[PDB]
Amino acid sequence: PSPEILALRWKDTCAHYSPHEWVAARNVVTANKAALADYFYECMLADPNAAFFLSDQLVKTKLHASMQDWLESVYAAAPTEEYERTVAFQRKVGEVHARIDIPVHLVTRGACALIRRICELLDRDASLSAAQAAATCRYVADVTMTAVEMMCHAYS
């Protein structure tokens, strides 16, 4: 629909959680964003179906930086209240993947890898309580899947 309609959805999704979850998510992600980019592309490059669209060269010189930026954007949206900008960036990214025919199932898997690795990182935070750590993991899955849904509008 409208990027104004989508911005509301994002904000509604994040509004289920307190700013404390937004911040814990955004901190663990900004501290580990390069290692999250590493983990993502080493998963992709190892799948011959996905390494069809990837190369070790294209990762180290472009996608690795693009992925870090994408992580920062996803997790700064609610803290900054920059909902309309992030949803526009998501539709731009989604449009790049549909144009070159990236299988949507591989986009789904990549989101799943990010969710898993962030949540494992949150688990070892120790500076978070158990309930705070659990609420934040649920927010991580929520907001990453929201971002991917925006991206996947380009496939319909």
Stretch of 17-25, 39-47, 99-107, 119-127 lying at the interface with Ca ion (CB under 5 A): 119-127
What is the Cα–Cα distance from 19 to 32, expressed in whole angstroms? Answer: 20
Stretch of 3-11, 75-83, 91-99, 121-129 lying at the interface with ligand HEM (CB under 6 A): 91-99
Residue 145 contacts which entry, Ca ion, ligand HEM, a second copy, none (Cβ below 5-8 A, type-dependent): a second copy
> Based on CB atoms, which residue is closest to Ca ion, 5 or 130?
130
Of 64, 65, 77, 70, whose CA–CA distance to 93 is shortest?
A: 70
* Residue number closest to Ca ion, CB atom: 133
133 binds Ca ion (CB under 5 A): yes
> What type of residue sits at position 44?
M
Stretch of 27-35, 61-69, 79-87, 116-124 lying at the interface with ligand HEM (CB under 6 A): 61-69
140 binds ligand HEM (CB under 6 A): no
The binder of ligand HEM chosen from 110, 121, 142, 146 (CB under 6 A): 110
125 binds a second copy (CB under 8 A): no
In the bound complex, what is the minimum distance in angstroms from residue 32's beta carbon to Ca ion? 15
For residues 120 and 128, the answer to whether their CB atoms sit within 8 Å is: no
What is the Cα–Cα distance from 104 to 152, expressed in whole angstroms? Answer: 7
Residues making up the chain, counted from first to last: 156
For residues 121 and 87, the answer to whether their CB atoms sit within 8 Å is: no
Planar angle of CA 123, 21, 70, nearest 5 degrees = 85
82 CB-near residues (< 8 Å, 6+ apart): 76
Binding site for a second copy (CB under 8 A): 1, 49, 51-58, 61, 100-101, 103-105, 108-109, 111-112, 115-116, 119-120, 123, 130-131, 133-135, 137-138, 141-142, 145-146, 148-150, 152-153, 155-156
